[PDB]
Amino acid sequence: MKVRASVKKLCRNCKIVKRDGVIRVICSAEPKHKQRQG
Amino acid sequence: SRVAKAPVVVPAGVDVKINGQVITIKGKNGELTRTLNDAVEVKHADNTLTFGPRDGYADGWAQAGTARALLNSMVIGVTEGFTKKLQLVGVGYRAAVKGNVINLSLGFSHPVDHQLPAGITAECPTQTEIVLKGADKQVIGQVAADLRAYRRPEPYKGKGVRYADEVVRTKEAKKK
Amino acid sequence: MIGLVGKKVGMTRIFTEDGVSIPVTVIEVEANRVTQVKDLANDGYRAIQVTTGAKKANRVTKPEAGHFAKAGVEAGRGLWEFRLAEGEEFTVGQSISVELFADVKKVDVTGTSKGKGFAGTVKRWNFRTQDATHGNSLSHRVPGSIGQNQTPGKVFKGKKMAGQMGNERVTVQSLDVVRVDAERNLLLVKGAVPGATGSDLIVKPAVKA
Amino acid sequence: MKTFTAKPETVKRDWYVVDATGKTLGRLATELARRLRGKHKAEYTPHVDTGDYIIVLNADKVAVTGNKRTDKVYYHHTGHIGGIKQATFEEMIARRPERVIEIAVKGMLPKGPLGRAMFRKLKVYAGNEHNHAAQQPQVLDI
RNA sequence: GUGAAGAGGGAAACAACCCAGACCGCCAGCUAAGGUCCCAAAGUCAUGGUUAAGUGGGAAACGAUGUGGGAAGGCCCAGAC
RNA sequence: CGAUGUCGGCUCAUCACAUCCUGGGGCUGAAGUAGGUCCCAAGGGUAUGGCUGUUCGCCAUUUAAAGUGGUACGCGAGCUG
RNA sequence: UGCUGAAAGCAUCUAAGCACGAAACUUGCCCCGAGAUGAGUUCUCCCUGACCCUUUAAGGGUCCUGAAGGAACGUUGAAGA
């Protein structure tokens, strides 16, 4: 995954979830869209 | 909210015991018992199960919803039971059941023997299917996640322990 | 399990039948005889205290003689103690022989090593010697620097310097027991164990796998 | 005339037993520190140990708020160089919970010979019973 | 303006910052800055909110269905999301 | 400035992690082998020589790897010069 | 990396609950270790006399006793400045 300080929805299947106080982008379509730490 | 507001319709022959927060549900398939959060007040009222937020607690609505769905699952877990179905894709992948130990041959240099927990009973109608059945939902979800976790579905070919319903998306090699 | 108290007799070799010399240490293990048994209900831990050998009658003091007299046993040259392993049971006055090691296959031998006195850091800590020539002025075997500068301005704890090497408890682990001889009261282990000849050893089964 | 000074030969001091189940650590600790100084007595004197003997029990059942059960970290250094050694609150409750109450109270008591003598009067136990039935500690509900 | 040439109280410790200008004495009172759970004097005070990050008790562009408040607006039980 | 010896070598370290190796993992334009990149991780390990006063560097041949820094560009009441 | 699961009638590894997960962390292994003044435990051994004085105290003194054991001395040691 991509640890960035701007996490965004790159696709329409991407989805912002906060787990353990960490903003994350969980996608189902493309696993390259998986992101962390916004 | 919209989930906690709908009541759990308890069918006939199902025993419900509300010992404060502890809820025991025993039907035709087995005794199954939780202990809800303190922010959930549960009331039988002779016909169904009704879930509401205990007053004085902030997120109790959210908590109530969970309690709802959990007991809904418990009702299915004493009436019909839950069933996960896994299938093994690969050349020479074997699955067998001795007692409650799932023997698995997954291209390893050592045999795999997964010990099922107490409430769960697996079957193998074929060498490449594991149909496991049980009462608690998180427990068969757990066990199916473990058996998948030994050899996860490889992306290029599909080789691995997949769920029967899950789609495995593939891709080709780099060039040629 | 428990161990037994020996005595380092010395070293020899054991020619095998296919012609492989094995360096063994001979450990005479006489009758270790139990003088005290310790239970949780009185001591907080299960352990046996054994003695071995023999002592002069006029050299054992009245405290010590009263201890062995209570135990109903001859005075030995010392008292040792072994922690018990939860299903073992001993009685006071019971004798324990080298026969206990007739199954063990590999042991750990604990003794006091040979005292080398005040040793410098080249012997003690394997420091490397500085130049023996090329200008060097009175500093050949000396330790060099011992710390940094203003920051910290102290020598840290457990800086390797010179002092007493030797003469302390060391345990050698996982030695292959070559023979157990119940007739002559002997235990032949493969290798060197700590101590000079005649030193008291403590031979336990190996805790490593 | 002169202000009264308590005399340490003639200080009467009592024994108290405090159940530390579900109390907050700092708030209990501050009450114990007040009672061990002797700040609750009118004969308080800053160079005389006038306080009471407190038997804290059920020390493993003490409570903290927030995520302090897992995030509160107890550091100490061993003297050897890289000897910084940390232990969270739940690791301390598992290993020795007496150290939890005793660290707290000790940091609330005046440092110096007198406050060491004041800490010798705190007796903490991880269980529900104590050996000190001979001293008849009356139940200090705090 | 202060220090220099100015002590005292506060800011942990801290010429120059805040309060305040020491003739001497007193085991007397009231206050300033600053504070009142324990070290450490004095509210573990009262009422109403907010945050759960030990934020409080370092640090920005930028990111985010964290969460409290306010004014509007699109669709909506000819059934919306 | 009524003296705080200053490069480099040796001896002896020690900490940081912005990790060279070993260990865990996500994405891959990841078939495998070998990689690239990013997250976690400081337990232990982390060359010998030619040339040069050299640190550095180039070269030769190794190695799992030959880390990057702080420590008075660590270390002359420890050595060299 | 998940399982169940709402807030958000879906989705969602997290908010309640639950399972994995590394040479780091706590143990396991080796050594020191009760001055651990918080000075611990266990076993054993020894000592079972009279009489005065006073500002009557865990007070001082005289006679008789001298134990268990230690220390000294000597012969010394694969222990040792």
UniProtKB/Swiss-Prot annotation, chain B:
GO biological process, one term: ribosomal large subunit assembly
InterPro entries noted in UniProt: Ribosomal_uL6-like, Ribosomal_uL6-like_a/b-dom_sf, Ribosomal_uL6_a/b-dom, Ribosomal_uL6_bac-type, Ribosomal_uL6_CS
Keyword Ribonucleoprotein: yes
Keywords of this entry: Acetylation, Antibiotic resistance, Ribonucleoprotein, Ribosomal protein, RNA-binding, rRNA-binding
Disulphide bonds in the chain: none
Keyword Ribosomal protein: yes
Cellular component, GO, one term: cytoplasm
GO molecular function, a single term: large ribosomal subunit rRNA binding
Modified positions (N6-acetyllysine) in chain numbering: 43
Role noted for this protein: This protein binds directly to at least 2 domains of the 23S ribosomal RNA, thus is important in its secondary structure. It is located near the subunit interface in the base of the L7/L12 stalk, and near the tRNA binding site of the peptidyltransferase center.
Family: Belongs to the universal ribosomal protein uL6 family.
Subunit structure: Part of the 50S ribosomal subunit.
UniProt-recorded name of the protein: Large ribosomal subunit protein uL6
UniProtKB/Swiss-Prot annotation, chain C:
A Pfam family that the UniProt record links to this protein: Ribosomal_L3
Modification after translation (UniProt): Methylated by PrmB.
Modified-residue entries (N6-succinyllysine), positions: 38
Gene3D superfamilies the UniProt entry points to: 3.30.160.810, Translation factors
GO annotation, biological process: cytoplasmic translation; ribosomal large subunit assembly
N5-methylglutamine carried by residues: 150
Gene Ontology CC entries for this record: cytoplasm; cytosol; cytosolic large ribosomal subunit
Alphabetical keyword list: Methylation, Ribonucleoprotein, Ribosomal protein, RNA-binding, rRNA-binding
PROSITE patterns linked: RIBOSOMAL_L3
GO MF terms held by the record: rRNA binding; structural constituent of ribosome
SUPFAM superfamilies with a match to the protein in the record: Translation proteins
Entry similarity comment: Belongs to the universal ribosomal protein uL3 family.
Subunit structure: Part of the 50S ribosomal subunit. Forms a cluster with proteins L14 and L19. In pull-down experiments interacts with CedA.
Function: One of two assembly initiator proteins, it binds directly near the 3'-end of the 23S rRNA, where it nucleates assembly of the 50S subunit.
This protein's name: Large ribosomal subunit protein uL3
The organism of origin for this protein: Escherichia coli (strain K12)
From Swiss-Prot, chain D:
Keyword terms, alphabetized: Ribonucleoprotein, Ribosomal protein
Keyword Protein biosynthesis: no
InterPro entries: Ribosomal_uL13, Ribosomal_uL13_bac-type, Ribosomal_uL13_CS, Ribosomal_uL13_sf
Gene3D superfamilies, alphabetized: Ribosomal protein L13
Any one cellular-component term (Gene Ontology): cytoplasm
Keyword Ribosomal protein assigned: yes
Listed SUPFAM superfamilies: Ribosomal protein L13 (SSF52161)
Gene Ontology molecular function, alphabetical: large ribosomal subunit rRNA binding; mRNA 5'-UTR binding; mRNA binding; structural constituent of ribosome; zinc ion binding
GO biological process, any: negative regulation of translation
Self-association state and partner proteins as the record states: Part of the 50S ribosomal subunit.
UniProt record similarity statement: Belongs to the universal ribosomal protein uL13 family.
HAMAP family xrefs: Ribosomal_uL13 (MF_01366)
General function of this protein: This protein is one of the early assembly proteins of the 50S ribosomal subunit, although it is not seen to bind rRNA by itself. It is important during the early stages of 50S assembly.
Name under which the protein is recorded: Large ribosomal subunit protein uL13
Name of the gene this protein is made from: rplM
